[PDB]
Amino acid sequence: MLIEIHMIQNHSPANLNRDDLGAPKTCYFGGVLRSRISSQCIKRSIRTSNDFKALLGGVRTRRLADLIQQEAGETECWKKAQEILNKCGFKNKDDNTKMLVFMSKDKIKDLARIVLDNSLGLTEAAQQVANVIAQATLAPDIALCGRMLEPNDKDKDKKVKWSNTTVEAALQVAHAISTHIARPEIDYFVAADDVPGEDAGAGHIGESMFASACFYKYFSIDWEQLVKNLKGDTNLAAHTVGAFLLAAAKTNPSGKQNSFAAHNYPDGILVEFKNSPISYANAFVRPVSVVKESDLVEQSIGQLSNYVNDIRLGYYDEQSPVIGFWFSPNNRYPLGYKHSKLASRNIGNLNELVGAVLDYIGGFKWEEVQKSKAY
Amino acid sequence: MLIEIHMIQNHSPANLNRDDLGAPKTCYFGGVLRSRISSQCIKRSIRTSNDFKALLGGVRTRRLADLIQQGETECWKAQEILNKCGFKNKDDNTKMLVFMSKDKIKDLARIVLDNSLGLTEAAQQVANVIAQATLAPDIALCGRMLEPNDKDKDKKVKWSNTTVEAALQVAHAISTHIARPEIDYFVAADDVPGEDAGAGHIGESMFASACFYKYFSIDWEQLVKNLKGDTNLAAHTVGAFLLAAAKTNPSGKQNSFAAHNYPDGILVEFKNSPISYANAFVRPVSVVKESDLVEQSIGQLSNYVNDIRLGYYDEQSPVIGFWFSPNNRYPLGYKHSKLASRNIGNLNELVGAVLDYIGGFKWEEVQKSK
Amino acid sequence: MLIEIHMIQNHSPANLNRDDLGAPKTCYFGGVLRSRISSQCIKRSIRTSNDFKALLGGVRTRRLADLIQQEAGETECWKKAQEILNKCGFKNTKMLVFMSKDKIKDLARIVLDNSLGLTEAAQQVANVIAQATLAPDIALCGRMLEPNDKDKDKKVKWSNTTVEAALQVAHAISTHIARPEIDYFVAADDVPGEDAGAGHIGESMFASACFYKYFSIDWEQLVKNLKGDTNLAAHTVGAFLLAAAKTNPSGKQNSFAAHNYPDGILVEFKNSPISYANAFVRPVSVVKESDLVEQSIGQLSNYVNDIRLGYYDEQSPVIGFWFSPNNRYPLGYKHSKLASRNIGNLNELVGAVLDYIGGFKWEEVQKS
Amino acid sequence: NRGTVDFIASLENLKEGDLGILRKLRGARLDEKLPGFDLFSALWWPLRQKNQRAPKREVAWLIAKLFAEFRFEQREGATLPILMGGICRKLEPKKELPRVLARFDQLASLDIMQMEEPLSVIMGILRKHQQVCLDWVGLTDVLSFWEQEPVKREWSDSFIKAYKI
DNA sequence: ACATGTGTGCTAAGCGCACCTAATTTCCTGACGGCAATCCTTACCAGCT
DNA sequence: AGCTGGT
């Protein structure tokens, strides 16, 4: 059971992701230039969303000692936590451990209980700390995203041992590619030289780039792995799938949104279930040329319908069924009118869609999978 | 709690956001060229507006020396010890447009910068009297950016985290149709007959005319955290923003293109998540002989609004909103009626309805906050 | 008799393979830079594919003693196993050893635990390793084994470990000039701080390209190394066809979920294989009409034309196939009407190629 | 050459509206808009009947588009790999220098038509460093012969020579 | 890739812009894995042809 | 009874 979500989103003039010099992220798809949003952006926007608070629980941080000190309260505790964590094998150079460490939040309490224990020696305390850190797989964020801890070897106490600290990711996200041929535009900003003085010229001028695009976004969620690394909590797993769907639909990357308030919802979502991941990025190898009798989003949905019906004919007539729940708001744009039978269930409501997918996975209710949370 | 504004205007032949060449700004939306009014321009015209001249609490200046001037002569005392903060002088400037307030800043920055008290000991006082305030409405809406240089500033400056998030999200105004640029040929003609019948300077001007769509979103609890518990000034902010987005227009080449026009449609929604109804106008509005451009654009907007309302809603929390047309010439299309909770014909009553949703603050006593 | 399987795959911006520095692999084909996917990565991803699990029966391990120790509840044999292996010829925990999984598991367990010897125990363990040819993944990828001559015994011999590879996967050559793109990523520190900076500013390089993928089956070799049977051979050929059309290299797919599918299949039966790399010696530059996939297919069909007439082999004609789903992408847009059996499915072409292999069917063979 | 100089001088004569419509045609061929082709024909036709040597047509169109977008001034001795490299010495060799350096080397393995965006980013960082002069004639006659490797290696060695000084 | 198909009969000269303007802090990863052989002999000796 | 592949 692999749940995939294909999203066609039209965005206003925006700069939702950029490189070092400020240009929006571009890719050469099909030999032509297309604007691009990175998968880490949508991944973290899903993670830091307005429905995933009940599903949080991860910190991929470098300042563990601050959290252990905050648990310790007003008991100093910075120096001995620092020396213990340096003794495990996470070296510090300026003030922080020199690698990212990912671990559930609820283990902070017993980690600080190890740290505040003065009866233990040095290698025993560091080994207990490493055991607590390495066996912290209680959150859904580490369930979806993944983990790796490889402690440093030269400046490490010899009597320190680590179990398997690596978890496997249950969420696969692709980079959002522009459906149409993408061109970047040029904007210069100015500053406010509001108080006159004597020059009356310019205070500051510059150069900024932006692009508007219709984006194709991909999400891929496993079920057995997500419930395997969530130790079989099926209510929690169904809650993750549902809240992840709502987050992917209702949230956008927070890149320069204060100046480009591009908060446009998906005008078509294809939610499907089968064993192996399909992909529809090759639907738009030829860029969409806008003619006057049609629209950009309408033609993008039509080309997506052509490719999806195409590979459903060439891929999905087997003994293994493939069932999809096509979503548009209130049926704005249905599928290709030359077929009119591709979608299994023409869904017009996102909440009836989340009820339907929760019913399909094993049979679940949003009000009943909300009752289980990990935080 | 998010307060959203969606507007529809239509201006005369205009040059509002011209190029350094002179060409009005364009962007591509849906594969077709659309006239764009810059988000920075909309925000600045909002800030400098007449009805925003009752809210201002910040200047965001460049060279604070002349503002800290007006014993009665503190300079070269202002600019000379201004270099210690990491803001060097290049033809008596500070080389960084500091995001920074205007009332308490100027009223308590004279006491520590009128010489005395030692250099690099008044640097911490500079940090206190520059990087602390944030109790300005327009600054907290527009955010705050500050940075001291590391090359010239001394190590006695203890700069805290001055990064302050913005409570406002505006989008660039997009025309609802295919933009067309008009090349107005023009000359400069001489009147004195000092030579043969010449003219003088010949050249060109470029302009356009369009029907614009503007989107705003005012965060509520983020704003009330940014102002730290001032409810009435927050109500002043939201109401003055609702008034200033409508009644005020950009100030580009308005001397030669007077396109002051009022929005014929304002839609305000109240959700805990943001949306933008810009995908309605992916298809440009083709003007037909039986209707007008504004009415057709408003009909497409009503189509999209009803559609998104039926598709992304029916929670336990419904979506409540008020629709504004002036004297009801443009109701919400001819489709499904009663979509908006209240169709309001006047702007001040729409502002009052938003304010009554906000928690029950009126419009008159809120202005007594400032 | 040998089978050719050609694909033309366009991919989303992705990094399916990297070198030591992290750049996507590049080759200088035709005087210009072409994006490359390593053959071994494709072979590994097709090995680990979700449809080969009925046929995945080869293990490449140095921890053989760990495999012995796992299947023993209370009889700890891991130092005795280690010294048996250490005088087998491997010298250390060892080098990489290829074999069948279940065969070595059960019968190396029974041949190791008995307290009957230490020298002949290593000799018979080595013979069990060398006779482990009952696996078709070994038959496809190939395996030799060279033990040391220093850390061994003079009484321990090794039989001929000759296993030929029944598969020649080519490296996926891009159909145009490679445009290697630089991705700039940061790592967010979840807890805040004074600096408001990234935990790790890093380097990643990605390349979006239309890859000419090329495989080849030596079916005669596939049955000369898989003994006299042909049922397992037909099952493996069908399994590879499904896997290659269905799976992708497991590179940075968690960061670039490019699971796009091959937009072209060309299966041609002959005794002299051909790659259509010379179909794209001229780099494919797109035009305003059509797309990169269609221009690449057009150049490929032009090459198929002058190697089906100029280099014609009418003693053994082409049984050239397609996967044109309901004829979305035809080959002969101007002249090349030589696609004899253009179809729009995948199981149909699987069944067809095992039909010209011999008297087999898709469903009956899928039980070995 | 005595033919490309007239082309650059005629380009410097172009007024604001003409290079505005040239600015709007970035990344677009000279066919989908009639006024752009008309402007290019007016700029490109009359210099073939007066001097025997002219640049390539695609080079002229690309250079006209880039000139409209950036608007430098013509000065001898200010080719791309001198100002480039001069700005590379004003860098930290640890991180940013490989970034900008790779941005520069991307140009050396590209055909004429696709260099619009890499030349755009190179001239964007040139504009960020406030560069006014660019030898448009020198750039044009090293670009019209960009397909022979001696001039590419000479351009690269000019970058090396400007970097070591 | 202006010329050349004139076909009662298709003008034209004077005129085309100057200047202020581009900021920074910091952030940058650890470990594990790295192939064996075979390309002249201490040469006779015993498995057996 | 010698020969040849191994030590």
Strand partners, A323: A273
Give Cα separations from C112 to A3, C59, C130, C152 (angstroms): 46, 19, 16, 18
Written as one letter, the residue type at C173 is: I
**Chain D partners within 8 Å of B202 (Cβ):** none
Q: How far apart are CA C260 and CA C247, in angstroms?
A: 9
Instruction: Note whether D128 contacts A183, CB cutoff 8 Å.
Output: no
**Chain A partners within 8 Å of B306 (Cβ):** 330
Q: Which residues contact B167 (CB under 8 A, 6 or more apart)?
A: B140, B141, B143, B218, B219, B222, B223, B226
Written as one letter, the residue type at C198 is: A
Q: Which nucleotide is nearest to C155 (CA to C1')?
A: F7
Q: Choosing among C176, C182, C286, C287, which should be mutated to test the D contact, i.e. which has the most D CBs within 10 A?
A: C182
Nearest CA in chain A to D100: A21
Sequential DSSP letters for B203-252: EEEEEB---EEEEEEEESHHHHHHTTS-HHHHHHHHHHHHHHHHH----S
Q: How far apart are CA A15 and CA A262, in angstroms?
A: 9
* D92 contacts chain C (CB < 8 A): no
| Closest to A38 in 3D by CA, of C256, D99, C16 | C256
**Residue B271 host element (H or E):** strand B265-271
Q: How far apart are CA A30 and CA A181, in angstroms?
A: 10
**Chain C partners within 8 Å of A170 (Cβ):** none
Residue B98 to chain A, least CA–CA distance (Å): 10
Using the C1' atom of nucleotide E23, identify the protein residue whose alpha carbon is closest. Answer: B96
Using the C1' atom of nucleotide E25, identify the protein residue whose alpha carbon is closest. Answer: B147
Geometric angle at alpha carbon B289, from B286 and B292, rounded to 5°: 65
Nearest CA in chain A to D26: A183
Which of A191, A212, A260 minimises the CB distance to B29? A212
Nearest CA in chain C to A26: C181
Q: Please tell me whether any atom of strand F lies within 7 Å of the Cβ of C154.
A: yes
Which of D27, D96, D127 minimises the CB distance to A207? D127
Tokens for C80, please give them: 């005795």
* C325 contacts chain A (CB < 8 A): yes
Chains that touch A (3 or more CB pairs under 8 A): B, C, D
Nearest CA in chain B to D16: B21
Q: How far apart are CA C43 and CA A286, in angstroms?
A: 30
Tokens for B78, please give them: 């202002």
* D23 contacts chain B (CB < 8 A): yes
Strand partners, A29: A32
Q: Which residues contact B128 (CB under 8 A, 6 or more apart)?
A: none
Q: Which nucleotide is nearest to C157 (CA to C1')?
A: F6
Tokens for A265, please give them: 């919802």
C-alpha of A56 from chain center: 13
The DSSP call for residue C94 is -
Helix (H, G, I), strand (E, B) or coil at B314: coil
What length does chain A have? Answer: 375
Q: How far apart are CA C182 and CA B205, in angstroms?
A: 41
Q: Which residues contact D60 (CB under 8 A, 6 or more apart)?
A: D7, D40, D43, D44, D140
**Chain C partners within 8 Å of A278 (Cβ):** 259, 261
* D148 contacts chain C (CB < 8 A): no
Q: Which nucleotide is nearest to C154 (CA to C1')?
A: F7
Strand partners, B342: B322
Q: How far apart are CA A318 and CA C69, in angstroms?
A: 42
Give Cα separations from C22 to A210, A211, C203, C206 (angstroms): 29, 29, 8, 9
Written as one letter, the residue type at D114 is: Q
Written as one letter, the residue type at A247 is: A
Give Cα separations from B135 to B53, B97, B101, B227 (angstroms): 17, 18, 8, 5
For chains A and C, what is the number of CB pairs under 8 angstroms?
A: 135
Residue D155 to chain A, least CA–CA distance (Å): 25
Helix, strand, coil share (%) of chain A residues, nearest 5: 35, 20, 45
Residue B346 to chain D, least CA–CA distance (Å): 41
* B311 contacts chain A (CB < 8 A): yes
**Chain A partners within 8 Å of C181 (Cβ):** 26-28
Tokens for A192, please give them: 């406010």
Burial degree of A169 (CB within 10 A; 0-12, 13-18, 19+):
buried
Listed by number, the residues of chain A in 66-95 with a beta carbon closer than 8 Å to a beta carbon of chain B are: none
3-state helix/strand/coil string of A144-184: HHCCCCCCCCCCCCCCCCCCCCCCCCCEEECCEEECCCCCC
**Chain B partners within 8 Å of D16 (Cβ):** 21-23, 203-204
Its sign, for the CA torsion A127, A130, A134, A137, is positive
**Chain A partners within 8 Å of B60 (Cβ):** 192, 194
* A20 contacts chain C (CB < 8 A): yes
For the stretch C61-88, what's the b/e string if a residue is b when 16 or more beta carbons lie within 10 angstroms of its beta carbon? beebbebbbeeeeeeebeebbbebbbbb
Instruction: Note whether D19 contacts B21, CB cutoff 8 Å.
Output: yes
Q: Which nucleotide is nearest to C150 (CA to C1')?
A: E36
Instruction: Note whether D20 contacts B23, CB cutoff 8 Å.
Output: yes
Which of C185, C189, C261 minimises the CB distance to A63? C189
Give Cα separations from C320 to B104, B246, C169, C301, C311 (angstroms): 82, 67, 19, 11, 15
Backbone phi and psi for residue A9, each to the nearest 5 degrees, phi listed first: -125, 125
Q: How many Å from the CA of B107 to C1' of F1?
A: 124
Nearest CA in chain A to B42: A259
**Chain B partners within 8 Å of C194 (Cβ):** 160-161
**Chain D partners within 8 Å of A26 (Cβ):** 117
Helix (H, G, I), strand (E, B) or coil at A238: helix
Burial degree of A249 (CB within 10 A; 0-12, 13-18, 19+):
buried
**Chain C partners within 8 Å of A2 (Cβ):** none
Written as one letter, the residue type at B235 is: A
Listed by number, the residues of chain D in 29-68 with a beta carbon closer than 8 Å to a beta carbon of chain A are: none
The bases of strand F with some atom under 7 A from any protein CB are 7
Residue D111 to chain C, least CA–CA distance (Å): 9
Q: How many Å from the CA of B61 to C1' of E33?
A: 60
Residue indicated by tokens 């001032």: B230
The widest CA-to-CA distance across chain D, in whole angstroms, is 53
**Residue B2 host element (H or E):** strand B2-8
Spatial contact of B350 and B242, defined as CB atoms under 8 Å apart: yes
C-alpha of D135 from chain center: 8
The DSSP call for residue B332 is S
Listed by number, the residues of chain A in 234-273 with a beta carbon closer than 8 Å to a beta carbon of chain C are: none
Q: Please tell me whether any atom of strand F lies within 7 Å of the Cβ of C150.
A: no
Which of D26, D96, D124 minimises the CB distance to A207? D124
Beta strands in chain D, from DSSP E residues, in sequence order: none
* C326 contacts chain A (CB < 8 A): yes
Q: How far apart are CA B95 and CA A204, in angstroms?
A: 9
| Closest to A374 in 3D by CA, of A87, A49, A52, A127 | A52
Residue C187 to chain D, least CA–CA distance (Å): 16
Q: Please tell me whether any atom of strand F lies within 7 Å of the Cβ of C149.
A: no
| Cβ neighbours of B26 (radius 10 Å) | 19
Instruction: Note whether C12 contacts A279, CB cutoff 8 Å.
Output: yes
What length does chain D have? Answer: 165
